[PDB]
Ligand binder design. Structure first.
Ligand code: MH0
Ligand code: MH0
Ligand SMILES: *[C@@H]1O[C@H](CO)[C@@H](O[C@@H]2O[C@H](CO)[C@@H](O[C@@H]3O[C@H](CO)[C@@H](O)[C@H](O)[C@@H]3O)[C@H](O)[C@H]2NC(C)=O)[C@H](O)[C@H]1NC(C)=O
Ligand SMILES: *[C@@H]1O[C@H](CO)[C@@H](O[C@@H]2O[C@H](CO)[C@@H](O[C@@H]3O[C@H](CO)[C@@H](O)[C@H](O)[C@@H]3O)[C@H](O)[C@H]2NC(C)=O)[C@H](O)[C@H]1NC(C)=O
Ligand SMILES: *[C@@H]1O[C@H](CO)[C@@H](O)[C@H](O)[C@H]1NC(C)=O
Ligand SMILES: *[C@@H]1O[C@H](CO)[C@@H](O)[C@H](O)[C@H]1NC(C)=O
Ligand SMILES: *[C@@H]1O[C@H](CO)[C@@H](O)[C@H](O)[C@H]1NC(C)=O
Ligand SMILES: *[C@@H]1O[C@H](CO)[C@@H](O)[C@H](O)[C@H]1NC(C)=O
Ligand SMILES: *[C@@H]1O[C@H](CO)[C@@H](O)[C@H](O)[C@H]1NC(C)=O
Ligand SMILES: *[C@@H]1O[C@H](CO)[C@@H](O)[C@H](O)[C@H]1NC(C)=O
Ligand SMILES: [Ca+2]
Ligand SMILES: [Ca+2]
Ligand SMILES: [Cl-]
Lengths: 595, 595
């Protein structure tokens, strides 16, 4: 295969330096080095790649070959013996709403994507991998360990394809494999607008001069907009219920329809851009399509940044917030804005916050219809449950009123994700997200737990007792040692997520470090950061401070009661207030008379 | 596809319908369909695109793949074996001045521009294409044939970048790839004023309310104006002589400084707008900056149209003039005003009319200084030879008194263009304009010779003997067959230009058809055509008939003696008369009292 040898800039660079707007592609943000943070480039490395053969082959590729002396345990064996649990009772997070989980995934999709090597080329090398479990080239199968229930049910393996990667480049230098980030490293609403101008154009209402995003023309949510349907086949959203035959939504990000609440959040964000465009049309009738789009885009861009840094990261990082993301001291153009390879695994802490069910709630936040509570696994690539069952309002009430799953050392990932995950190109609700994470760490040539512990100036346990100490759990440490033999070999994803959460936070000290560092860098290293002088007026920045997720819902649904702080656990009706009481985004400071 | 929806970048501006002036962008000319003829749209297709893969990839992309059975020959091999010649003796056109050549290029640049995917000169992918000759994406290298002298001197290839294309500006294809026309399809002096309002504003003297175009403030031509300097770096005009360090001129068209006589013609046109503005200021003191600019612009607009249709096209099309451009029957709003893809190659007949030298002539039309006669290749992106060596007057005398090169089946393109062309982003006087033309036909998915022969209801030869008959040349036909194998595969540019010229014209029957059709359409389809009732008064149209290139020179240089008809071969002194004897543009009919 060797898909994408390189990698050279598909969209090139057109650095119009007097432009006050971000490029779609993230190009020209850093003037010294224009390609920093741009889409379809190599993920940054904070540490060098670690491969079996020093180059491309992941640890666990060759049966014989070991890692610091010891064999690497099968991903799925780690999943079963550490990450699995049966009893969904008492697992919910008492002080975080489901929106906490959902916003994590929205942010993640803005920041990074490392899609599978793109070509089958009308080929059965896709099925050759899946059907016959033959390791080779980009087929890197997850092998089931002995006694795995799925041996009886699914055969020898789950299929897995290695992430795409950059050049054999003209020097043809001996180089480590570097995975591509297909989206813009900047927090810039790229999941709404796209990370490539082909898509970004295709997503716009251009037949109208109002700088509107294209909306669905086949269905409506009580007069409120849905995303257009992706009519490209084969559609996995139609596959999951062939009777309903409802396609996936077309969005700025490839993964928008991956699960119903993600599609829902994508719907809120789209409605908000169009709401901003027709409000700026009233204030500035002389402004043309491009100007409305770009200003709406810039505002939405800043909304995501503010909600992320003011509301979201403080409750992720807790006691470590000020240590890693201090108060803002302005655009430092020598900071690397690019998303690191390791961050893409660090931010998968989200996977342990996803509970087993999604609720639809009515206008009194009571169960909506007969089947209010749906198991998560039925909502993978599910657009019909939106179009043909009540719109997004009942789902949005669910996000405010239901709880995220709490990370728990004895109950890590729900079987809805660990056993019943649906992958868009395969036929079965039978995959393991946790196994995929461990396999993917290896694919990406991830350094081990201690390598990253070291990188964060934290202790590097070499012993059962030393690990017991860091994890504050004897049975967990013992299980990890039985499988990995050394904490050096522990795959970063399970290692970071094994660490007890920090005070007032929702991740361990190691992930706090890794997340904190990256979030500091995408702020400080962003020339279009919202707080950077000259991006917005002082007037505009005063008005942008009032924004809230609560207000987003009010302005873009038919929901009237919302809580003041949407990310904390809020029960109806005590913790809810009327939409009329919530501060608004006053757009007066955008009013451009005598232009 | 996104078909019926596909749209690329554009300013998306609305229509002030009561405006009596052209938009900068060509928007709102056609009221039914406002975008027709506007800048930064798809070139029209008269026949469907023909690509290797039916979509985007040009014929000659894949070494393997063939065209109607036969492989397509390397562009450079066609250049060397057909288009080249050594002997510049007797090649001059004895009945056309050099202004004939120069006016062609001026008109061309008003009408169409399909710029390369714009490289920022900040990437390794620019040099990756140039240095390693690696075909991929927008790098489509011109490969040297074996025994080509440039192998020893320049490596394996000339670099070549594919023209930009619509909706997706990076690669996505389901409908055929359509190249952009970055200028206004209307004959409207857009090369003076710009095809985009950011530029058009930036080119004006706005700090004075006299509707003047900005002029050079660093240098003067015996008190007469030069265009401002293009401050954008790196400047290729200062690259060609780093001691002189003289930048390229800033004009309405990107290509103004491509060669010294083009820059010269751009200088005359600019001086004439300013001369019109300060004459209309005298006649109408109450008129403001906008009104002076727009009326000056409208007059100059009409000048170019009249010289083109009354003087230029008759001597291009000869016997075919009346057939294709009959007498004017008024604005037909159902005619397509857009420039076709194929026209942009048809109008490159100009390339075979460019002679090997440019002369500076003194006040007696004698050699000016010791180095009067300069080889053409030294005058690519050459502004210093104007600023620091005599101004434009000696060069303008050259245009009147020297001859255009004659198209010749045995002597097609001078080595000045065929071996020694300079490209603005590269370092060497080493490119081949003919090779680039053949490569560019393929890039633009051009149908073959016979496809266009057919489109013009002319015979479609399938044999050596049949081709010999059409070309009235045995050795040319034989060479074409040895390379292309079928006349079906012959690239439109070399095919049209191979055809013996029509009676008292300067192109063959095929180009007569293609040029004639397009010129008919940009007249008939233009709502602001100068002869269209209501654009000008009957009085104004009577005064506009007197204009001449001879008069333009008189009013805008320090030249005193000029011929009555500048496009014919005119020798000093018999055919020259005094400037006082030439009919003037009487601007009395623009006098607008009591407004
Ligand atoms: C708060 C963060 C977060 C949340 C919540 C989250 C929630 C979910 N996830 Fe998942 N997810 C998160 C962060 C990621 C990241 C960072 C990546 C890696 C992306 C990349 O390629 O760079 C990821 N998730 C990657 C994935 C992948 C791809 C795995 C691979 O091939 O390696 C899948 C299938 C996926 N998720 C599913 C889901 C589903 C389903 C949900 C919820 C129902
Ligand atoms: C009578 C017409 C005419 C004349 C004379 C003429 C004279 C010249 N030329 Fe050239 N040229 C003419 C008509 C064109 C056209 C129509 C185009 C295509 C433009 C477009 O993008 O739509 C063109 N020339 C395009 C070009 C290009 C771009 C080629 C490519 O990349 O595909 C170059 C470099 C160029 N010329 C050089 C020159 C030079 C140098 C001279 C004279 C000194
Ligand atoms: C692109 O934008 C244009 C307008 O900016 C959209 O066309 C507009 O579509 C709306 C429907 O969304 C139309 O309004 C409708 O009027 C009927 C008739 O009374 C009513 O049944 C509906 O409730 C609705 O109000 C409207 O005709 C039309 N506006 C204009 C100016 O044409 C177009 O749909 C957008 N396209 C995309 C892809 O988003
Ligand atoms: C040299 O160039 C000039 C181009 O202007 C040519 O002179 C012109 O020749 C044309 C033929 O295409 C003559 O057209 C004729 O016009 C008269 C009108 O009185 C008409 O009776 C004829 O039917 C014909 O249409 C034109 O008179 C003549 N013009 C001038 C000013 O001399 C000439 O043909 C070229 N010579 C060569 C050898 O190519
Ligand atoms: C939940 O967290 C919020 C802010 O993170 C805090 O103000 C509140 O006291 C906490 N409440 C509970 C019940 O944990
Ligand atoms: C599929 O869709 C129909 C309505 O479109 C619905 O009644 C049915 O319950 C769905 N089937 C499943 C498996 O959920
Ligand atoms: C920018 O960040 C670097 C660390 O990469 C730091 O050394 C430097 O002090 C910062 N620059 C400024 C001006 O604060
Ligand atoms: C503006 O107008 C004045 C007088 O008309 C003139 O001196 C000046 O050169 C113009 N400005 C520019 C930049 O050309
Ligand atoms: C370069 O420019 C200078 C004027 O600055 C001129 O005298 C000299 O002859 C030029 N040299 C070349 C090599 O063109
Ligand atoms: C106007 O345009 C159409 C060609 O598209 C043609 O059918 C019609 O005859 C034209 N009218 C005139 C007067 O040429
Ligand atoms: Ca982004
Ligand atoms: Ca034009
Ligand atoms: Cl065409």
């Amino acid at each position: 295969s060797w898909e994408v040898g390189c990698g050279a800039p598909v969209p090139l660079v057109k650095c119009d330096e007097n432009s006050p707007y971000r490029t779609i592609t993230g190009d020209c943000n850093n003037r010294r080095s224009p390609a920093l943070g741009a889409a379809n480039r190599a993920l940054a490395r904070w540490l060098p790649a670690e491969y079996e053969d020093g180059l491309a082959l992941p640890f666990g590729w060759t049966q014989r070959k070991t890692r610091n002396g010891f064999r690497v345990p099968l991903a799925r064996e780690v999943s079963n013996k550490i990450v699995g649990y049966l009893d969904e009772e008492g697992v919910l997070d008492q002080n975080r709403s489901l929106l906490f989980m959902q916003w994590g995934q929205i942010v993640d999709h803005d920041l990074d994507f490392a899609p599978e090597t793109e070509l089958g080329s009308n080929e059965h090398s896709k099925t050759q991998c899946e059907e016959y479990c033959i390791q080779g080239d980009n087929c890197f199968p997850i092998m089931f360990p002995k006694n795995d229930p799925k041996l009886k049910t699914q055969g020898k393996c789950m299929p897995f394809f290695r992430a795409g990667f950059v050049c054999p480049t003209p020097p043809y230098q001996s180089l480590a494999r570097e995975q591509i980030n297909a989206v813009t490293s900047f927090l810039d609403a790229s999941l709404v607008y796209g990370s490539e101008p082909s898509l970004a154009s295709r997503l716009r209402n251009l037949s109208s001069p109002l700088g509107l995003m294209a909306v669905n023309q086949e269905a409506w949510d009580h007069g409120l907009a849905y995303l257009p349907f992706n009519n490209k086949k084969p559609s996995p959203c139609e596959f999951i219920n062939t009777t309903a035959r409802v396609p996936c939504f077309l969005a700025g990000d490839f993964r928008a329809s991956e699960q119903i609440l993600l599609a829902t959040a994508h719907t809120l964000l789209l409605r908000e851009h169009n709401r901003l465009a027709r409000e700026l049309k009233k204030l500035n009738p002389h402004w043309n399509g491009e100007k409305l789009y770009q200003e709406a885009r810039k505002i939405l861009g800043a909304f995501i940044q503010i909600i992320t840094f003011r509301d979201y990261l403080p409750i992720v990082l807790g006691s470590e917030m000020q240590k890693w993301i201090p108060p803002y001291q302005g655009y430092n153009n020598s900071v690397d804005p690019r998303i690191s390879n390791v961050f893409t695994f660090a931010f998968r802490f989200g996977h342990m916050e996803v509970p087993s069910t999604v609720s639809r709630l009515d206008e009194n936040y009571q169960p909506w219809g007969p089947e209010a509570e749906l198991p998560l696994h039925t909502l993978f690539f599910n657009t019909w449950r939106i179009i043909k069952d009540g719109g997004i309002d009942p789902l949005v009430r669910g996000l405010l009123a239901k709880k995220s799953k709490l990370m728990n050392q004895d109950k890590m990932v729900t079987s809805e994700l660990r056993n019943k995950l649906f992958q868009p190109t395969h036929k079965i609700h039978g995959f393991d997200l946790a196994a995929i994470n461990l396999q993917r760490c290896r694919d990406h040539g991830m350094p081990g737990y201690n390598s990253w512990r070291g990188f964060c100036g934290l202790s590097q346990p070499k012993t059962l007792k030393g690990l017991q100490t860091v994890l504050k759990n004897k049975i967990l440490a013992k299980k990890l040692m039985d499988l990995y033999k050394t904490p050096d070999n522990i795959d970063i994803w399970i290692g970071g997520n094994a660490e007890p959460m920090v005070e007032r936070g929702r991740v361990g000290p190691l992930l706090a470090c890794l997340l904190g560092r990256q979030f500091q860098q995408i702020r400080d290293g962003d020339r279009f950061w919202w707080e950077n002088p000259g991006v917005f007026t002082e007037k505009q920045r005063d008005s942008l401070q009032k924004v809230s997720f609560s207000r987003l819902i009010c302005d873009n649904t038919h929901i009237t009661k919302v809580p003041l702080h949407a990310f904390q656990a809020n029960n109806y009706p005590h913790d809810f207030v009327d939409c009329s009481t919530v501060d608004k985004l006053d757009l007066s400071p955008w009013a451009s008379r005598e232009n």
